[model samples]
Target chain A: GLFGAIAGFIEGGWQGMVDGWYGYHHSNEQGSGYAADKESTQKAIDGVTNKVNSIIDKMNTQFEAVGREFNNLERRIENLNKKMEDGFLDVWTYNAELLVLMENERTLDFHDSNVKNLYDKVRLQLRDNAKELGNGCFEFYHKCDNECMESIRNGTYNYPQYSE
Target chain B: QDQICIGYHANNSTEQVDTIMEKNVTVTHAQDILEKTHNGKLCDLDGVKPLILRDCSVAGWLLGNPMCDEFINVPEWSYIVEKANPTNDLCYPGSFNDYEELKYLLSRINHFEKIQIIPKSSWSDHEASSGVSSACPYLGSPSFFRNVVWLIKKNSAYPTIKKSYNNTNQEDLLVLWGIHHPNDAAEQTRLYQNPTTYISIGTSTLNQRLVPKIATRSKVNGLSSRMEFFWTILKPNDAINFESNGNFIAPEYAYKIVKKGDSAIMKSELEYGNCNTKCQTPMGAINSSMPFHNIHPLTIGECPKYVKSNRLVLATGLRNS
Candidate 1:
């Protein structure tokens, strides 16, 4: 004797269930298709959708433009790093040449005269006894007064500039 | 190029604080003229405030470049400037650094804050009108070097020398003992890197071992040393009479003077001892045209090697004027 819920749902009992549970009495709802005395709600929804789509498209276009610029900056940074490495390599080579020049005794005379005498003395000392004793008085060998560097400066040995 | 100076720590009641220019240091030991000192308008890392040091022209010069600049071809210098250089003008000027300023600043370490110059001038050179650097002194000014740097530096009086490695120390006029002259720039570089190799030998006896008994002292207000020696003095009579007893210039015997103790002897009596004819060349025996002060009386007069003597002077000069 219990009624099928589905059948009851189709009857006035279903109407009561919807009204009581939804508090449908306050609803003056009906399909707008029933008619609007003025503008339609669907028309307003359509206008908002159009504006939102336009804004989204424009934002995507700006991101592409900014992305290209960021990539260009990274390329310039990479080039600067390469040039700095080049400069470092040049300095390293120069240091090697300086090391070689230092060991060369004859070359040292060209560098400095005290360096020259100093270059000459090691050989002279190894061979004699009295010679070693004589060497003792010169613990301080030579000082480079301003005049000493004249060779590289304006001295006779200097690299002459071109007036000629 | 910055006008380089040395920072000698201070001592006394103010110890380092009293001796230094505490907060506002206009000039610094390692600053360029435009360089900043701490508490300055623009201070960077080397901003540590230096203790105040009193000034003297000669003392300032002492604080200035301790040159090996004048040492090139002078035969009294090591050609190995590994720890040296810069004055690139003709060799731009700051070529050597012996920390001579510390000698001037650390006066109280060994004795007094008293400094004296036999010569009354800023420099002793009389030949150049501008460079008063010792070729001569005042025909009469305070720059005229006298015959006494204490007439006798008696290392052991009221202001006696306090410590030593027993017989090993360095500082005080140059000597030719155990020094390496150099073979080439490379060898000279090696010598500088390990200078102990050059001046680390013996001339006699044994407290034992050749590695000079390293005596450590806080000379510039506890700042350590560049070298050590049994601080002693030389009398005018001692240096002047190189003819009679020059061979007997022992450390014990070298500093002996009469009643005036370390008083000045008349400059006229400084007869350059026998080796005065040239720089007291032991082996290099190089010659100088200018009348350079001949240290041979002490270098050649004492033991075969000054390092072997009970005392070795690391460097020498008139401290704190």
Candidate 2:
């Protein structure tokens, strides 16, 4: 009877092992499904990250370009200021020299025939220099005039006093 | 055989059999072990079961938070889940990361043209004045006296003398009388001699003309009366005409004559003046009040009719006499 009972037990255990194998197979299928879902979700996250980063990079580039343009504009204004200053100095120096020459009483010695000839030559030279200087001043101011008029019309250019 | 039978019987009771055959075999075994080991005894098993169960659940729900000492910590899992949703509105429809999209948007906006972006160079106000003056030859001269009248009317800087007369409230009469009124000339010359007063005779030529007239007028009118006499000269022609009409009333009129295409001449005369004195003498002659003050010095134009004959006669006289 004992031997018969042991054989029954062995048969039951074999059936249990078969059932366990099927259960293990089902578990593997479910786990694989979960993993596939997770992978696809992660890919979506990565795509959004890439897009956001790209936009940020473009915005940065635009800001940098704007900064560079402003810097260039500032430099151009500075250069114009220097040129204007140089032109003004030229006019001032010419006028000062002419004033000094005219102020001298001895220069009137031109009334003497002997001194008149020499005076005439010097006067001619002085007149020529004055003309050249005046013309130079006119030309320099001419450029400024055109620029300033255009700015005023367009409403973009402001004078130093008016800028504030 | 008797001993084996006794051992089987001991383990075969209804309670032990039910425990072995419970639906959750592992859970039942764990509970059974705990009950048997600590029956009627109290211990600190408060957090142990919850921790173990949390660990098990976390392993199964991989998307959930990890287990902490007594609770589930879900920060990591929550972060990953939230990241799945679109967070930025600026990146709507399509992400802003695309350069093509950004370029398209920028192209639609109105922006400064290349030429407009650069600042304009500086220019001189005098250059502009020169341009206007050069373009209109009569602008700075007497022949285009009407132009100077207009300048005075408009209160322009080109006909500089207008400023002085204008301030004195004589601009209207000055314009009507024509610019080269002897009084205007005298006043301008007087103002020119005095640096402080020179600002009234605006332009280069008008200012220069002031000197001779001022000297001539000062000789007749005492120095104190010069300025008053100069002011009187600027009165309206109608008023002067009305006042001087009866005694030496000789009617004189001025007209602008166009010769060639652009050449113009003014014919004018003062029909009456101090006739009691030598009429032909420069000092005794009454001058015609014509609008000669408006003429610019450097411009080329036909001489005034009266002056033309005199100028020619003078040329002839210089040659003969």
Candidate 3:
């Protein structure tokens, strides 16, 4: 529902939120992302969200019974693709999510150090996953620092519980 | 002009299979994806996959080799990362940190011809024309453009069409269709998260045969609304291969015996009066509600304007239409 609320904010000049996002990134440069013009930033959101929206779209289009029939045909691949794109879109989203929540509600603002720390954790975690497995090869490791960061963001995520 | 009708390829040269296409790679046209080695393919480089038609969810085949062989400065995130990010949906546990065993168990069918993917959102009856109260009676009705996702055909002779979304070679020119994402960035680096995929692909194509009619488009709330989509491929922009607009029948979907330079028109519902011939001329008169795109099939320079995907299956054989 937070994103739904965020989605509602999109029409009335998402430009502001986008700019705010760029502002945070520019000052801190916390995540691996570089600052592009306003247009490219918008395009990046479209990249992952469009994929997310489409996944939901195609899933809804299937007939319930038929969807079951194809259940065996789909789960794993879905997980794999979901895992990939989720890694990509979520950071920009989660990164921007913090900024938007803080902007929209004054009570939600984090201390300056807290905000930078949260962004740093998310950025570093993303970098970790994209890196190689040492010595002539590669693979995404199941490791990150999402928990401490989210706690810093003060339940901004309802943060799930898990381990590697 | 010896041409085989769409869906009519036959003899021992045929092989049939079903695959659920979904979004896989998720980087934009002008960016570098930082994740790799999914199912052991090293996802960063072009591994016989289709080049991105435009800067959509998937990027085109790399202009330079996808291999990172020559570079000493390989980006690494080896240090300072601890447990997986619990807040991130991508955060998960692999039991014993056995990335190897987990990889196999994740989807055992990583083998070729085992699972083909289609972008989860690219084409749907709904995508053709978003409507008043959500209705598309035309799509999964008695007939319409039911086969939406076109499988990437791997051929060595794919040409370098001018004005393409990305300029790529004819070698292994595979293309992904019906999988464009209109929201979010195409993809961010591999670490934070990668684009999502799905478990989709059919049985063995052990023998030569024809693939059955594919996934269907359905009608909702007994309404056709506005429906428009085309099945076309990028050909040389010059007069020889180009024929005005939407002229080259959409690849195997058209199945009509016509050739322009090295390109061939497949089969399209429009060419044979399947849906409505006149409608074919105007893409069923379906006003496109797609953001930042055109309704008609695209050509060379026109690629930047459209991102429509069509239904075409892959097969090999000889038949007389």
Candidate 4:
């Protein structure tokens, strides 16, 4: 049972290992079920192991959901850039749209520093692309860049994939 | 009582229009005058639209003589008028003989009602105390005064003083206000990136329709964080000027109003900010937590953002308050 708990720690991850260790220690301290061969410790460890996978799945789903939202925002930025290039969008309209975009971007938290870093990099690249259009036109665009960078720098963490 | 003349009126009685109309001559004579005036080069001037004189009939108007019974519109006449002159005033586009002749020509050429000549000594009678509040709630110790020699346009709606974070409910009202600073180079440059003074124009039950509300204050570097509110009612071709520190600068920022839309073509030698772009006040308060100027320090005389010379929408119409 102790070996199974250690093995669970190796494969199932931290929480499962912690639960297995707690169950074995608690039963041993009770001086009952000292043999632990009836799956007393094994059953609790396996149950927690199963739970860890489902929780991980939930976390992964949230991470993937955040990733999808980021993709939509990135797509929108590209489309706005195209519209501006095609002359359908004036600088005034572009600035207003960017204001809305930045507000939306501020609310999204990727929960991983690496993911945030990558998101910030794309935003920076997009800002440089916007600058190519002309001078003095991207006041709000630059403001968005600064504000988003600030939010990302001070934002909270979210995903389990951050460990792996 | 000294009266300052802000504008002139061309006396365009039917008699004058008839007189100018009678001066119209034959096509051959008109062509000869056109040749004498421009020598075929009038049509060749750069940016001369259509690049063609149309015919000698149109050319007649160019030489101050219309073709026999032919109609010449203001646009056709203005082409030659503006090319010869740099001023953007539509009624008095260029210099003529004397005030009488100018009046005579303007009366015959442009609409009479559209051109208002405020030569009466009544502007002084209309001058009164300005009571409108500042956009900056915490702005302290202002040196406020107003003696607007000319009232460009008056607000027709019910006058009500309001203070709000946004103009969302004031959308239906035609609000009149003014942004001003001393004409000094250092002072103008100091407040170029931001505006430091405002003249709010609405008040209920007052003798003067527009009581200029002057609000001027100084903070760090003589600069204070100001929430900006916008103004409307000043039309195209209207000019405004003010006296600051005993100096009254001339050639006030005269707007060339756009015919296609509501935006005005703001022409001024002094640098200024665009209100529509930033969407704030002539003045708003800022604290330590929210420091003013979140970006780089702007170079003196350089605007914070790109200022379009041709199109500055000074008056964005009412918003839902």
lDDT of 4 by residue, B155-197 (tens): 3211122221112221122222233323344543333222232
lDDT of 3 by residue, B1-321 (tens): 797765543333222321222233221122211111112111111122111111111010111111211211112111111112212111011011233342232222111111111232532221222211211122223212222222221221122111113212221111212221112222211111223321121112111111112122343334311222221222322111211111011111111112111111111122111121111111222222222233345211111234333322332223322
The DockQ score of candidate 1 comes to: 0.00
Identify the candidate with maximal DockQ: 3
Q: DockQ (C-alpha) of model 3?
A: 0.03
Output the worst ten-in-a-row residue range by lDDT, candidate 4 chain B.
B29-38
Q: Would you list the C-alpha lDDT of every candidate in the order shown?
A: 0.21, 0.22, 0.25, 0.25
Model 4 chain A TM-score equals: 0.20
User: Whole-model lDDT for model 2 versus the true structure?
Assistant: 0.22
Best by TM-score: 4
| Candidate 2 local Cα displacement, residue B10, angstroms | 76
Q: Single out the weakest 10-residue window by summed lDDT for candidate 3 chain B.
A: B56-65
> Once model 2 is optimally superposed onto the true structure by TM-score, how far is the C-alpha of residue A63 displaced, in angstroms?
6.5
Off by over 4 Å in 4: A1-80, A84-164, B1-114, B117-120, B124-179, B183-198, B201-321
- All models, DockQ values? 0.00, 0.01, 0.03, 0.00
For candidate 2, write residues B113-185 as lDDT tens digits: 1111101121111111221111112324322111111111121222223212221222212111111112344
Whose TM-score is higher: candidate 3's or candidate 4's?
4
lDDT score for residue A159 of model 2: 33
TM-score for each prediction? 0.14, 0.14, 0.15, 0.17
Worst 10 residues of 1 chain A by lDDT: A61-70
Model 1 lDDT per residue over B73-123, tens place: 111111111101222211111111223322322321221211222222322
Error of 4 at B168 (Å): 27
